[PDB]
Amino acid sequence: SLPAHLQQTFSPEEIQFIVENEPIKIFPRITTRQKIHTRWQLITTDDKALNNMVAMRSTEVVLWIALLLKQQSKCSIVAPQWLTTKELDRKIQYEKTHPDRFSELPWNWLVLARILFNKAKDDFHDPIHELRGKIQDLREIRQIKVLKGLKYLNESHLQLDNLSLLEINELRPFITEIMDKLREIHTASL
Amino acid sequence: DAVFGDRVRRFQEFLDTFTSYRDSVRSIQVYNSNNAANYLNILPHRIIISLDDLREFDRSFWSGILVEPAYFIPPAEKALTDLADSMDDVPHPNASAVSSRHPWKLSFKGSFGAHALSPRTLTAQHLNKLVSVEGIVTKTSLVRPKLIRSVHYAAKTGRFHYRDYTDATTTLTTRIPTPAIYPTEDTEGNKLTTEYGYSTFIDHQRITVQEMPEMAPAGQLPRSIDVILDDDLVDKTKPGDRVNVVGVFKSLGAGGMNQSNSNTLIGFKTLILGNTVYPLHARQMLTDFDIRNINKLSKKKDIFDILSQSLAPSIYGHDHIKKAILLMLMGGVEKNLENGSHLRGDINILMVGDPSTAKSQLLRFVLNTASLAIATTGRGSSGVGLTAAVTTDRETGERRLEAGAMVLADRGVVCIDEFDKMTDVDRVAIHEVMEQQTVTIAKAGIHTTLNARCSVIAAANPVFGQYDVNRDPHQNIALPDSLLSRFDLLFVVTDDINEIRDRSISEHVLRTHRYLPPGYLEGEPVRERLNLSLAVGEQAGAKLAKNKGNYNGTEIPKLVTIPFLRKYVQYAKERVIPQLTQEAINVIVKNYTDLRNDDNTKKSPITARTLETLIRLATAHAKVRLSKTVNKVDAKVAANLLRFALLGE
Amino acid sequence: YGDLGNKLVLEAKRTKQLYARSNQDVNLPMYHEDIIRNILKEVSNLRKNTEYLKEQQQLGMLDDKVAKCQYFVTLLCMERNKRCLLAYQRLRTDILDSMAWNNNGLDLMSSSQQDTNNLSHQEQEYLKEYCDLITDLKSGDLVDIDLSGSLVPPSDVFIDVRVLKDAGEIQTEYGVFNLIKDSQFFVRQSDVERLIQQGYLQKI
Amino acid sequence: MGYYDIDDVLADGTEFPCKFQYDIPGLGYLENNPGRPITKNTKLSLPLWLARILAIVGGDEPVPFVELLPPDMFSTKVMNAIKTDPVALDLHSINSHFFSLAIKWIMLFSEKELANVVSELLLQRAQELNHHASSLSINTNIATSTFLLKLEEMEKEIYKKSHESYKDTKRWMFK
Amino acid sequence: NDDDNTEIIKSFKNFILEFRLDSQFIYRDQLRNNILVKNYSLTVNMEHLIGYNEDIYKKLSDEPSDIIPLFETAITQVAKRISILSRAQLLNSLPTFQLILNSNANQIPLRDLDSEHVSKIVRLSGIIISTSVLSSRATYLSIMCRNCRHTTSITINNFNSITGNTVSLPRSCLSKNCGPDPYIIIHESSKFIDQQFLKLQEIPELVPVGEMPRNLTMTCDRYLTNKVIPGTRVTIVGIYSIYNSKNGSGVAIRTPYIKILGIQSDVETSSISVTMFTEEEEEEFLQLSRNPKLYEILTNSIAPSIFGNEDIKKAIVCLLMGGSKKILPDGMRLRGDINVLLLGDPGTAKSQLLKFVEKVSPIAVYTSGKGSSAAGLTASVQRDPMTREFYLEGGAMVLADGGVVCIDEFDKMRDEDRVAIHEAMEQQTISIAKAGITTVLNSRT
DNA sequence: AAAAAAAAAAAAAAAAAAA
DNA sequence: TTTTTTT
Ligand SMILES: Nc1ncnc2c1ncn2[C@@H]1O[C@H](COP(=O)(O)OP(=O)(O)OP(=O)(O)O)[C@@H](O)[C@H]1O
Ligand SMILES: Nc1ncnc2c1ncn2[C@@H]1O[C@H](COP(=O)(O)OP(=O)(O)OP(=O)(O)O)[C@@H](O)[C@H]1O
Ligand SMILES: [Mg+2]
Ligand SMILES: [Mg+2]
Ligand SMILES: [Zn+2]
């Protein structure tokens, strides 16, 4: 949709939606194993796990169902391997020791972090402030590396092997317009 | 260490790349050799480089110059001296002159960008960096020689000895200072006699430059900075001139970091070691097709009234006033006789009239149009402070005369507003400078006559709120006739209330207020702007770009732009000195005899000095049409203008 | 001569900035058809002049080079005038369609601008036609999905809603909501977005 | 090159100096006395939208009616100024359609020496644009405003878009 | 001795890096944005400092001059940490960062300052009367010897505890048999900062009975310079300290002064030639400008306590807005202001409008026509007590350039004093020719 | 250890003068 | 007698 050129990029709400559209692991509190009751019978998710769950056993559900159950008392989200101090430490060490390559980190970087911090405040094993500070440090370091790398902007192409979602989204318009103008100048010269 | 050698050889390569500078050097050398012993001008050892070419050659060396000149300029000067020495070839030189060792210091021109500042903007982070600052010349110190390298001789040994002295302001690089004690004893007790005529002395002058008051913040005073220049260019320009100086901005002196401090809040000194100076002049030369255009304009039949109407197009009416201003800006020649002393040469005009009839506006236009002019106000001036002042120079502790207002405008024009509102005492001084164009100062042990040949334009109000046309003209004016008879032309302006003229002037004024600067929209106010891109600046006859002067179509008669008019004035005031003939004599004498015995009412009584005014007006009008002789047409136009100015149409 | 046209075009730019700064379609300003008809009469003058010059060119006493240069100059003048006028009109149409697309195609005169008098009659009938198309589009294969709904992704199910204007009681599916003045509701998100767009509810 | 783009339409309106390479009787009616013809080698300041065409038509030695002189904006003076230091240059003062005019001029006359310098100019300005866009409030200096008032009109939209993107990301991140 | 400094710096760095509200680390983001736009400064709000920990506030309260440099170097350490990559090991053109404080303590008037406030943090407000020109101060000095001829660097902090506080030159050389202090200052390769001096006068309505206002001297440096102009009400936060007077009367005298740390102004230097308002305030101004009858809102708002007069209030508003300045190709200027004269009977409250108009306009001065003179308004020529050199000092009408001037009892002024304003208001430029000083000075009011 | 002061500009009070 | 201007 146009609505003042919203037809060219993604709004942060759409990014949050497209991230919460992802599977995650859960630790249920209740049981709904069939009598051996209502069928889940959704259209965009394997209902087999939903129908076949039993308490205190790990299983995989999409993110927003887990969030809805966490709004109730039928859920216990299991954090990924990132969200612990001893992994973020080696990660920040990797960024420090390699001043040219962005560290390996998925597209959903910092978004799952924001959502889990906002909702699942209590299920963590680590204090929240430590993790938030380390994530802030990672954000600052990657921001510095982005500014350092942006200095050279060829008119042909570029490679950004390990940028996450929001980092690409925020930078898309400026970069795109600058290279468009450069390409227009070069093509007009010929 | 060896970095100096590498920089020197790189600069040598750069100098070898370009061929203009070597041509300049050989031209200077051949001129100096030709001025040696051939049946007074000399060329100083200075060459101007354009650092745009240097940037296009090497960015590193250019950046080094513009960031830290201390470690970059001396190697360039050394390389230039070595090249000049190698090119030099004098098998049979002199003795005292060969030991000068002039190092051929440099001058710069080109685009600076972020290093072109103003005296208010200079601050801590700009220190130790080559800069170029603009401003106005406030005051100048006295030229004083200083020593560099002395020469000694001993009779017993016969070996000449020399000692070299340098100070902080002498060289860009700080070195261990040496006192000025003359060594007169050898290492073995031989007597040494200082040899004058073989030692080295260079001129020294300090000036202070001030920011232009027009570009000033909201309710803040203009500020100034300190400039030192020496060797050449030592006494160029004068106080009251627009200049642009390029030099090194450095700090000097301990500033109280030693034990000599008396308070915690001491500071440091800041100072500029000037390299080169240019006349800003807000250019003054004539091209070939410029002269062709001036000639083709002059040979036209009706140039004079076009030039008159060209002055201040936003003022309605007052055509004869415009003609008078045009004739005044390029007045007649001076006359000096071995027995007849001197005769005054230019024209003076006074304005008296009812309020709000556009006199101050026309005076401001004359300020902007003329080459050299100074603005004065009757209530804001003091007579003693107008001609000279007795002030003590700080460095020498000696009291020296300081130039007054109208002395600065010698050969120019001085405009006075609210003339009748001036203190009567000051008025007598005016009479003196209107008598013989010379002011004498005899006070505190100084007896000196100062030259001042300027012309005066002024406007004054009548004694009442408005002019009374039924009264004696002397009754309407507060000034004594002693100085009123001095003025050649007196004009009376009154706003007669006629609805037709009211409508016409209303249309004109409303046309004026609907004006927009080109390239700018109407929704936002006027903003400040940056200086020109280049700190220093500098197919023919087939374009007539600004030659015709008609910028827009509003009337069939032509018009000319201001710069072309100023160029015409500059050409006319130099290239022609006309002489009168007997036909103009006959016309002038006939008109004078008739006017003397017309015997009717007139604005002012006439006497013998009016014939001088007729002579000078005819000379000025001959200068206008660029003829070496005065013809009777100029006599006729002068007589008509005088009749208008004194009788009334 | 077409400098006058720039005066129109420049003005249009300001209107776009009005869109840019606000980032919401609102209070479209009054038209400028006066300058437009001034340009129309001057271009009629240009056209009649060109026709006359072609007449004298065919008559035989007119120089070919003069005729051709006059023709090119006049043609370029007409071209620039047309370009300016259509440049204004295209932006006007775009902003009109943007305004019409989000208000469910009903023009909502009861509760943007109040009078809509700042629009030309042709523009108003165009707006009516576009509303007709907007109503028609969702009546076909896509009847189950309201194309003029929200665009914020659905992020939560239960939200707090605080009343903004007073009304009576309004029925919903399986229940009824009474719009008492200045009260708070704890209701489902997918029920009150229509009212929120209408401006009767606040505090999402 | 867009027919329905406001900035291009405005930029077509600037005046460029040019000279009548050919003499035509009866011309100049729209500027001066219609009865008097225009003589050869006459300098004029014609708008771009017609000077572009009148210089290529020829009409007929099929030389065009007009010959276009080098405009003052593209001068050695400006070339030196832009090369020495572009970041602090108030290019807004020179012209308010500089980049589109540069594109059109280089399209009309292929000149490899302008493409590289203009590209480097805008590339260098882009870094400072990004620097200022990233900065956000949470007491304001003159540097930011005095930079922002020197920009070309076409850089303003990039600045606003980047600023809005950063502001939206920050707002979403902090709730 | 060093351990305490390390502990204090570590504590301040921990405060900078650990303080957070909701989900934002405020000061780190401030540092990032400041570094991006080349404003090497940081602003600390005292309430946050107290809330985070009270002992650090106690230490800052006890000895300000000894403690502040530690914080202002911890700031630059953190900035280097979070702005530059170590690259497994350059320019490093980051000077020591300036620290600016803000607080909301009880104001203390000028006359209440006494001996018990020496070396303490105090808050006060006054009026600015005179500003000195800028000056340079050294922070990193390159020092070279003569005999042994070795190089050394001296680092200078600008905070003074004792009056001297300065190591002039080290005694003896560094290791033969040199003199007492054979050192010189290498002017090249040194770092300099900027310093300015200001004068403060007591606020008129807090003057005690039968007194004359008292002056005080302040020192500002680095970014704080060139922020205020004379005649603007200000609020200053700083340290009240003393400096000895050897060049000076009495015994053991020590003149006091103020070291500026933070400045708050009512005008925020906005008019001092571009617009810098935030988007919220500009939007609000546009919203008020969109009101269909704001003319009546402003007309009512002019002197609400004065009853009945309408055309005068409309004229006052029209004068406050002012005209439109113009310029022409040939140089002719056109005035852009309007001048209103009230000529009325007694008891109609003419001056009650004058002082309110003085209150509203951002640049306004109020003076009596009886207590005025031609030389005391446009330009006054002084001469220095020491060097005797003449210089030009502006009066009242130039002090209110770019604003409005309030003159009452216009008839009582002398005839000689009423003629100097003619050109000053018809052409807006005053000319001075005194003692060889010729200057065309502008005045727009 | 000492440059220090004649020359200007500006603010009054007393007396005498003109209306 | 009063206000003005000069010392
Ligand atoms: N013929 C005229 N053309 C244009 N403007 C005019 C003309 N006559 C008067 N004016 C306007 O009258 C105004 C009078 O301004 P100004 O003070 O310069 O006049 P003046 O006659 O010199 O007055 P004063 O004796 O009071 O100084 C100006 O704004 C000027 O533009
Ligand atoms: N219209 C009014 N409304 C209210 N108060 C008024 C009004 N007119 C006069 N006053 C009162 O008049 C009192 C004195 O007024 P003030 O002395 O300022 O008048 P003025 O016209 O400036 O006098 P003067 O000509 O003697 O200087 C004030 O206390 C004020 O309240
Ligand atoms: Mg006047
Ligand atoms: Mg009063
Ligand atoms: Zn040593």
Side-chain angles (χ1 to χ4, degrees), chain B residues 454-530:
Chain B
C454 64
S455 167
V456 176
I457 187 69
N461 306 275
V463 292
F464 320 114
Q466 281 205 23
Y467 188 59
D468 294 349
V469 297
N470 53 2
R471 294 215 204 195
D472 197 1
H474 298 285
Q475 194 178 6
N476 288 285
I477 313 299
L479 300 175
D481 201 32
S482 60
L483 59 88
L484 291 183
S485 166
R486 308 275 96 84
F487 281 107
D488 290 345
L489 274 193
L490 195 146
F491 281 109
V492 189
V493 291
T494 303
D495 59 353
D496 51 354
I497 299 179
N498 197 295
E499 76 287 339
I500 312 300
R501 292 294 304 273
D502 289 315
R503 164 71 62 167
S504 292
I505 204 172
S506 309
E507 281 325 283
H508 187 279
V509 174
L510 268 297
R511 256 168 302 178
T512 295
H513 285 282
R514 295 203 324 111
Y515 190 83
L516 207 51
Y520 187 60
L521 74 164
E522 89 277 17
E524 291 202 24
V526 295
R527 271 169 298 232
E528 283 289 338
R529 82 285 179 274
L530 185 62

Side-chain angles (χ1 to χ4, degrees), chain E residues 39-89 91-150:
Chain E
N39 284 333
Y40 311 93
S41 66
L42 187 144
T43 308
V44 161
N45 207 357
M46 295 300 291
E47 292 91 6
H48 309 148
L49 185 70
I50 303 151
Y52 171 77
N53 185 268
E54 67 276 15
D55 293 334
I56 52 176
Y57 172 67
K58 181 58 161 72
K59 295 301 185 291
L60 186 47
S61 74
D62 272 332
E63 304 90 8
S65 179
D66 296 11
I67 286 304
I68 281 166
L70 314 180
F71 291 176
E72 82 188 1
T73 193
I75 288 156
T76 198
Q77 280 176 13
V78 169
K80 279 195 307 176
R81 164 182 171 153
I82 74 159
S83 182
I84 297 311
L85 279 165
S86 187
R87 66 173 179 85
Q89 278 190 356
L91 184 63
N92 280 323
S93 71
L94 301 183
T96 294
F97 274 66
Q98 182 159 37
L99 167 65
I100 303 176
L101 291 173
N102 291 322
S103 168
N104 285 278
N106 303 58
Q107 286 219 25
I108 314 176
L110 278 80
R111 218 168 281 265
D112 286 332
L113 305 179
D114 56 354
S115 73
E116 295 178 352
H117 302 127
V118 175
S119 196
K120 293 308 153 276
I121 313 168
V122 289
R123 188 174 180 235
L124 58 89
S125 173
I127 186 66
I128 292 297
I129 61 170
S130 74
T131 70
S132 76
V133 290
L134 55 87
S135 66
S136 305
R137 292 285 303 288
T139 54
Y140 201 88
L141 280 179
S142 183
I143 287 294
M144 151 166 278
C145 177
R146 281 102 64 82
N147 319 111
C148 66
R149 188 149 185 144
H150 76 266

Side-chain angles (χ1 to χ4, degrees), chain D residues 14-69:
Chain D
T14 63
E15 308 90 320
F16 270 40
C18 49
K19 190 175 64 86
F20 264 88
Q21 187 274 331
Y22 195 74
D23 45 347
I24 295 95
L27 268 190
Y29 44 93
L30 207 52
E31 179 66 30
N32 57 69
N33 296 318
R36 65 184 188 94
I38 308 303
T39 187
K40 203 176 177 68
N41 54 277
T42 312
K43 184 265 289 180
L44 283 80
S45 70
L46 285 175
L48 180 56
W49 59 267
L50 61 94
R52 169 176 68 248
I53 310 303
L54 267 73
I56 205 66
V57 296
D60 204 16
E61 201 179 348
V63 289
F65 304 121
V66 72
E67 191 267 330
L68 191 148
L69 266 69

